[PDB]
Structures are given as structure tokens and as C-alpha cells.
Subunit: 137 residues, 2 copies
């Protein structure tokens, strides 16, 4: 279930974080614009930038922390608040997050690893709702 | 995105090259008049024509290099000059290339693989513009 998925992802965070982020960018190529440094680089090329592996892991580490602190896939208001107030997220809207979760769930469904994909869909939905409440456009 | 798509195509080039060129010929059957002995044949007949596979592979080998040498989907002027000055391209105009890229983009959108189709559309347009600049009518 959801709890085990957090363990699965944490167990090999570098791989999962990189592969899910790439699935996001590949499904929604216009989102690459937010990451100027990743423009004009292939999937295999990106893994060689110290920043890429390190920065993607940091993103998915926090995602896992928000996921683990949730109750029944409902994130804490304080965690939603953190995500909105973050300076690196100043120009984002809830749609950016919606797209990430659509790509994340699609990745899980396509994988050979057994994920509670329905739960991640619901978590994504609840997070987006909590993000709007914390003032994200 | 675009740079990954190049790697994707290169990973199974002959298959992609034949399937995209076939999509082109089937969308624009009168375009066969630039080629020798393609008329009167089904897709499978063409894929068993030794020259068809060899030549179509060579077209896409070069197209991938032109894409790879590009910056932000803008090809090198010298790459465009080569395509204009090639003896095998003496009967061509920019509309021939426009048609090829319409078909390629349509193929990418229809495929189950995550191509950045909009970028290929831009690449096609920028290449046509560069062909024009290099003297193609
Ligand atoms: C639940 C989902 C998300 C979490 C947990 C999260 C978390 C983070 C974290 C921890 C960082 C700092 C990483 C570091 O530099 O150490 C960061 C930065 C950043 N975030 Fe997010 N984020 C999320 C969603 C998104 C989305 C959907 C976008 C837009 C596509 C986005 C855009 C950015 C950008 C552009 C940076 C700066 C990093 C860079 O560009 O190099 N984030 N985020
Ligand atoms: C970016 C697009 C294109 C690239 C990179 C390209 C490149 C090439 C290359 C490398 C060859 C040599 C093939 C060989 O001899 O093995 C070739 C030949 C040829 N090209 Fe193109 N070409 C492009 C577009 C087109 C288009 C749109 C047409 C016609 C609608 C066309 C018509 C031909 C013909 C008739 C030949 C020689 C005979 C044949 O290969 O069947 N090309 N081209
Ligand atoms: O650096 C980043 C990696 C992944 C996301 Br999602 C956002 C920022
Ligand atoms: O021989 C050729 C194969 C494919 C194209 Br497109 C053009 C020429």
C-alpha cells in the first residue's frame, strides 16, 4: 500500500527520483522551461550533472517526507504551506503540481514494481487542494 | 524532450526511419515520384526492398545529426546548405520537407512513445526557413 511505496521509493531514491522527474518532463515538455540548466540534454546526459541527481533527490526526499506525514493520503496543512512559500516555487501554480502527479501515477502504473497508484493519485489530489488553500494560484 | 528523442530514435533507427518514411509516403502518395521503384508496393514490400531500408536509414542518420547539431531546434546553416546542394535533392522545394515533417510529427503524436512532438514541429519549420535562406525554392 501507500506506506510500502514510500519504502520502495526511499530504498532506491536516486533511481526513482530521476526516473519519475524525467517521466514528468517527457510527458510535459513545456515544464522543462522552469529548469534552464536541463534544456538541450538527453535523459542519460542529465544524470552526469551533479546538480541533476542531487537536486531531484532533494525534491523527492521532501515529497516522501510529506507523504509519510500524511494521514490516509491527506497531507499536513503545514507541509502544503511549506511547498507554496518556498522561493523556488514562487512562479508556480497548482497545475504544475497536477501535471507532476499525473506523470507520477502514469509511471507507477507502467512499472513492474507493485505500487498503490490509486493512493498516489488521491494524495496528489489532496495535495493540490491543500496547496490552493495555502494561497497557490 | 528533443535531445532525448534523438537518442530514442537512434536506439532503433532503421525501424523508426522506415515507419516514419512510410507514414510520409502513405500521407503523401504522390511524393513517391521523387523516388525510384516505390510506386505499386505495400509497406511490407518496401520493407523488403534492400535499397529502401538502406536509403531511408541514411536519410534519418543525417536528420538525427542535423537535429543533434542544432541549438534549441535551430539547425546549423551549413547543415541546411548541404541539404540544398546535395545532387539527390535537385528536384526538391521546401514544401517537400514541410510534408515530411507534418507526417513525422503526426507519427510521434500517434505513437505510444513519449516524443516531444511540438519540438519536432519547430525543428521542421526552422529547417525549412534555413533551406529557404540557403536558396531552396
Ligand atoms: C510535491 C512536489 C514537490 C516537492 C516536494 C518539491 C520540493 C522542492 C525542493 C526540496 C527543492 C529544493 C531542492 C534543492 O535545490 O535542494 C525544490 C526546488 C525547485 N522546485 Fe520543487 N517541489 C515539488 C514540485 C515542483 C513542481 C511541480 C515544479 C514545477 C515544474 C517545481 C519547481 C521547482 C524548481 C524550478 C526548483 C529549483 C531547482 C532548480 O531549478 O534547480 N517543484 N522543490
Ligand atoms: C531533413 C530531411 C532530409 C534529410 C536529412 C535527407 C538526407 C538524404 C541523404 C543522407 C540521402 C542519401 C541517401 C543514400 O544515398 O543512401 C538522400 C537522398 C535522397 N533524398 Fe533526401 N533528405 C531529406 C529530405 C528529403 C525529402 C523531403 C525528399 C523528397 C520528398 C528527399 C528525397 C531524396 C531522394 C529522391 C534521394 C536519392 C534517392 C533515394 O535515396 O531514394 N529527401 N537524402
Ligand atoms: O529540481 C527539481 C526536481 C524535480 C522537481 Br518536480 C522540481 C525541481
Ligand atoms: O531515399 C530516401 C529515403 C527517405 C527519404 Br525522407 C528520402 C530519401
Amino acid at each position: 500500500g501507500f506506506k510500502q511505496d514510500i519504502a520502495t521509493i526511499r530504498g532506491d531514491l536516486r533511481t526513482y527520483a530521476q526516473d519519475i522527474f524525467l517521466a514528468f518532463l517527457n510527458k510535459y515538455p513545456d515544464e522543462r522551461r522552469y529548469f534552464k540548466n536541463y534544456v538541450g540534454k538527453s535523459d542519460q546526459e542529465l544524470k552526469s550533472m551533479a546538480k541533476f541527481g542531487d537536486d531531484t533527490e532533494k525534491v523527492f526526499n521532501l515529497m516522501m517526507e510529506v507523504a509519510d506525514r500524511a494521514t490516509d493520503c491527506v497531507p499536513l496543512a503545514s507541509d502544503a504551506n511549506t511547498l507554496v512559500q518556498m522561493k523556488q516555487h514562487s512562479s508556480l501554480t497548482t497545475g504544475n503540481f497536477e501535471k507532476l502527479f499525473v506523470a507520477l501515477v502514469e509511471y507507477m502504473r507502467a512499472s513492474g514494481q507493485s505500487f498503490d497508484s490509486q493512493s498516489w493519485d488521491r494524495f496528489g489530489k489532496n495535495l493540490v487542494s491543500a496547496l490552493s488553500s495555502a494561497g497557490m494560484k
